Amino acid sequence: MIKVEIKPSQAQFTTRSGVSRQGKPYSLNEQLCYVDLGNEHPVLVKITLDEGQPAYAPGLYTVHLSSFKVGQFGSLMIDRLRLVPAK
Amino acid sequence: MIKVEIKPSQAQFTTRSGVSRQGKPYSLNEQLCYVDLGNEHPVLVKITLDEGQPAYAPGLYTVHLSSFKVGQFGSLMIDRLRLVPAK
Numbered sequence A, B: 001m002i003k004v005e006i007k008p009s010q011a012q013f014t015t016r017s018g019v020s021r022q023g024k025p026y027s028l029n030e031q032l033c034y035v036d037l038g039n040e041h042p043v044l045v046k047i048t049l050d051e052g053q054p055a056y057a058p059g060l061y062t063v064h065l066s067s068f069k070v071g072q073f074g075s076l077m078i079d080r081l082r083l084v085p086a087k
Helices: none
Strands: A003-005 A029-035 A043-049 A060-064 A082-085 B003-005 B029-035 B043-049 B060-064 B082-085
Touching: A029 A060, B029 B060
Parallel strands: none
Antiparallel strands: A003 A029, A003 A060, A029 A043, A060 A082, B003 B029, B003 B060, B029 B043, B060 B082
């Protein structure tokens, strides 16, 4: 699957100003991850971090298609890849 | 994973004119598939079909991130989801 590896220095997200749809301000937390299934070396990619949800801890990761959708002429497309530990 | 189900009427691709990069004409074969992991009901989505590669036969499917890439501000994105039977 879309494996990943949350580096040891990427176990904590960051709080950054944010606004859902110009309705209310939301300083969601963002984190990082390292994907390799598409590149031997790890690629530090971004990963949203839900409030209650704690930054992606250390452990092999696997993106989640819970963020993917089907449509647009019938073409699958991620809407916000939900990362998760490889299990 | 991104499961799928190639319907019984979607076991054959179609030959349609095509052009890689304005270099040469390529009538690649395209097929279809039904994804549900993002919707109880199956969603008929498109799926490229390599020449030698035979249309996606009947059997649970799972998209392949072999078509995904990491970059663009660090955002994973499919470049041409490679479908494969769920195994």
